[PDB]
Amino acid sequence: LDDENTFKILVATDIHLGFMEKDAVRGNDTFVTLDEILRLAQENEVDFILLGGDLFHENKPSRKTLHTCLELLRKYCMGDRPVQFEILSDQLNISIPVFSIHGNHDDPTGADALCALDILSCAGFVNHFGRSMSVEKIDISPVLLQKGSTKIALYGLGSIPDERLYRMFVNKKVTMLRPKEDENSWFNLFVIHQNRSKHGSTNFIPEQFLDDFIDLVIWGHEHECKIAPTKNEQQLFYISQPGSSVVTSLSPGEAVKKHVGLLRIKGRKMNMHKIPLHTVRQFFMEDIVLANHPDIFNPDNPKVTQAIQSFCLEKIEEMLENAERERLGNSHQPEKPLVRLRVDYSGGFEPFSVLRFSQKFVDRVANPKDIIHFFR
Amino acid sequence: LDDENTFKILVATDIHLGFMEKDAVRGNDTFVTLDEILRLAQENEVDFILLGGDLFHENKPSRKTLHTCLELLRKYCMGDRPVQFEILSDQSVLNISIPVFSIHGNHDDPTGADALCALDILSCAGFVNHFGRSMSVEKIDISPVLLQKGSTKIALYGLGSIPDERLYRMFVNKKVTMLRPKEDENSWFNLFVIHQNRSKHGSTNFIPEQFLDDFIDLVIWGHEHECKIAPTKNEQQLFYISQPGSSVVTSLSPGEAVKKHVGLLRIKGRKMNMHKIPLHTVRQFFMEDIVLANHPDIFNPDNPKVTQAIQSFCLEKIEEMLENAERERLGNSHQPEKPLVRLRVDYSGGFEPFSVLRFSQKFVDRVANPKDIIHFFR
Numbered sequence A: 001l002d003d004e005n006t007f008k009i010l011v012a013t014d015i016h017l018g019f020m021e022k023d024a025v026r027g028n029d030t031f032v033t034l035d036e037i038l039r040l041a042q043e044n045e046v047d048f049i050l051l052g053g054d055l056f057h058e059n060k061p062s063r064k065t066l067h068t069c070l071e072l073l074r075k076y077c078m079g080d081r082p083v084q085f086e087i088l089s090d091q092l093n094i095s096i097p098v099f100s101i102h103g104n105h106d107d108p109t110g111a112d113a114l115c116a117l118d119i120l121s122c123a124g125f126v127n128h129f130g131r132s133m134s135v136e137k138i139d140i141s142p143v144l145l146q147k148g149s150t151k152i153a154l155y156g157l158g159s160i161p162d163e164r165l166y167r168m169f170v171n172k173k174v175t176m177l178r179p180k181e182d183e184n185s186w187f188n189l190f191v192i193h194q195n196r197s198k199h200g201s202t203n204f205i206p207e208q209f210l211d212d213f214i215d216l217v218i219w220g221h222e223h224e225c226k227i228a229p230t231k232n233e234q235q236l237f238y239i240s241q242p243g244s245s246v247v248t249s250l251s252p253g254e255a256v257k258k259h260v261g262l263l264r265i266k267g268r269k270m271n272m273h274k275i276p277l278h279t280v281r282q283f284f285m286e287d288i289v290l291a292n293h294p295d296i297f298n299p300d301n302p303k304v305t306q307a308i309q310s311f312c313l314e315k316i317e318e319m320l321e322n323a324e325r326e327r328l329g330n331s332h333q334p335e336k337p338l339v340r341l342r343v344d345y346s347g348g349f350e351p352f353s354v355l356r357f358s359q360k361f362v363d364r365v366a367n368p369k370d371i372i373h374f375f376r
Numbered sequence B: 001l002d003d004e005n006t007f008k009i010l011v012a013t014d015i016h017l018g019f020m021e022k023d024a025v026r027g028n029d030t031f032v033t034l035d036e037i038l039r040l041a042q043e044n045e046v047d048f049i050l051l052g053g054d055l056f057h058e059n060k061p062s063r064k065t066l067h068t069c070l071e072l073l074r075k076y077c078m079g080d081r082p083v084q085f086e087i088l089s090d091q092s093v094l095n096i097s098i099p100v101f102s103i104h105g106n107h108d109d110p111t112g113a114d115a116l117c118a119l120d121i122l123s124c125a126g127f128v129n130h131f132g133r134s135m136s137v138e139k140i141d142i143s144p145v146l147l148q149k150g151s152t153k154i155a156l157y158g159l160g161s162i163p164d165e166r167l168y169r170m171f172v173n174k175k176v177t178m179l180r181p182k183e184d185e186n187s188w189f190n191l192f193v194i195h196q197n198r199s200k201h202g203s204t205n206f207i208p209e210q211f212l213d214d215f216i217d218l219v220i221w222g223h224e225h226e227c228k229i230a231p232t233k234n235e236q237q238l239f240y241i242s243q244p245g246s247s248v249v250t251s252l253s254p255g256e257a258v259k260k261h262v263g264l265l266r267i268k269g270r271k272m273n274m275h276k277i278p279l280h281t282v283r284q285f286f287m288e289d290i291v292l293a294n295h296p297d298i299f300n301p302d303n304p305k306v307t308q309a310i311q312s313f314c315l316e317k318i319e320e321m322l323e324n325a326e327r328e329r330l331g332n333s334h335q336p337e338k339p340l341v342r343l344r345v346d347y348s349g350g351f352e353p354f355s356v357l358r359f360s361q362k363f364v365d366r367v368a369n370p371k372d373i374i375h376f377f378r
């Protein structure tokens, strides 16, 4: 009734299909989480799915990856209900289209310089948009969607090496074409796959660089979940940074609970509900600074390397237990948690072998080898 | 027997599918010639077809173009006989008996939200292997598709069309580099397909044959429309260059008047041979030059009835060209009926043009370019 003027969109990024495909424990992770994401898409009778990059972990997906994926899309993206919106732009029923950009992982490759998405696109399940051609200047054109009276101008930028893109912005070469008919009638949506934090001098892209006419920015390269839209104080658009749906690196950010988004756009206004992903392997992480507690740990003490070591076993022992606790209400979560302990030995301390650790936890952790880390 | 060590390859370029699709007379030209080309491929039981660009006239082919094409490929490229060679490289796309390897030209170039090419659609349907497309911005690294049939091995290198200025710069700056195979560099026949300007246009608006790595054996040069399909040796580099024509005339130029051909290329071990095959379905195109300053006896600079005397000779030249056409079409039942005809008129001295209207009209039904039948210059 009123919903016929509202876009319902499932928003996800960095699904990383096929990540650690061959590993015995973790190898089915991404395929299950993808099942959840598509299932959510279907339950919420979403208008279309919108992905921010890195759908595939490898730019040349294994037959297995690519087939599992197609099977899943076949399962959840087809159905009785007709697509309820239309593309005003150029170029067995499909009921849930998928719009995606390419990341740095699923980037273009091969003799034809295609992308995994392009295979998907070929099968009929995906609309690859956002891929830039030009060398000298980047002109971004919008896919124009329209549902009832409300109109989305969907802008994309498939992953580009940050150094280049920074340079391009600085030299005023990145320009965003606004629609011909009635610039102001459109909700301006922008999906990008780039570095948001600081890495080098130019190894990121400052939020300020993006045209202020943009309404919502889906920022997709960063794996840490920040899916709840937050306003940028200089430009005033919202930035949503959905997580990834797998942990591909044991970092503070990646420990934040993974979510997908349910995004509604009516007229030129939007709202973002977050949905938690239940099938994601848990990842608990804690820091331990030794220099912070002289009472418990003594710098010069030949039995201190043994006293520390004994506390780590306790910290890890409790993390593992808190895990078994949460998994109580969650039957969907895989059984063996990822666990990491970061140890800052600043002062007068020294490392120790992870072997004894690796062994004692072998069957209660999914990363027996990488369970601990040291630094100055 | 011995043929099981020999690649048979049909070679073509600038087919320009859908060119003047809508025109009443010429609109089915390209689709018929494509039919011939594929039919030749099939008769000669070729191993695979190899195209040098501009398969489609438009980078966003009309439904009609794209469907006719797929119908044709479906017809001639499928069959009982299995593919007899294998790809040692990574990826390749009812049996397919004649694969098509192609590069993109400047017409069928990448476009759209996904930055794909018409070939990529074809590739999707299963009929084409798009190769040669470069990605990088700063440097071009060309990698070879590795084919092998029996004992003989082709390292097929491609370069999808690039704007000439950029490519020239790249070559000069030593940024274009061709990766040679890992295993046994010397075991391979080195084949290179490119779609670029060969003649002189600007200072850098072409690519000098010398720029290409001398380790290449045969170069299929595909952007140029003028048929020069018979391989000829380059005196500095020593590779052969074959420049198959286009299979349609898209511009009334001297070059385009040369009789169109496709190639039948054989590679055994590291040696090759190129038979040329003439395309019979191509609309004829006759063209003659007429320099007025060359004949003062027949044409007088100051003479109010000279513009009428010239005009009367043109009608005769054209009248005879048209007749020589009807002559050749005698043995050729496949050739479309209405010839293209052009007369180039150099009025250097003290002459002046005249209206093509009377001409356009008098030939309307005996020529396929009534409007463009004549040209003037200094």
Ligand SMILES: [Mn+2]
Pocket: A014, A016, A053, A054, A103, A105, A221, A223, A244
């Ligand atoms: Mn990622």
Ligand SMILES: [Mn+2]
Pocket: A053, A054, A103, A104, A105, A193, A220, A221, A222
């Ligand atoms: Mn990424």
Ligand SMILES: [Mn+2]
Pocket: B014, B016, B054, B105, B107, B223, B225, B246
């Ligand atoms: Mn051409």
Ligand SMILES: [Mn+2]
Pocket: B053, B054, B105, B106, B107, B195, B223, B224
């Ligand atoms: Mn061309």
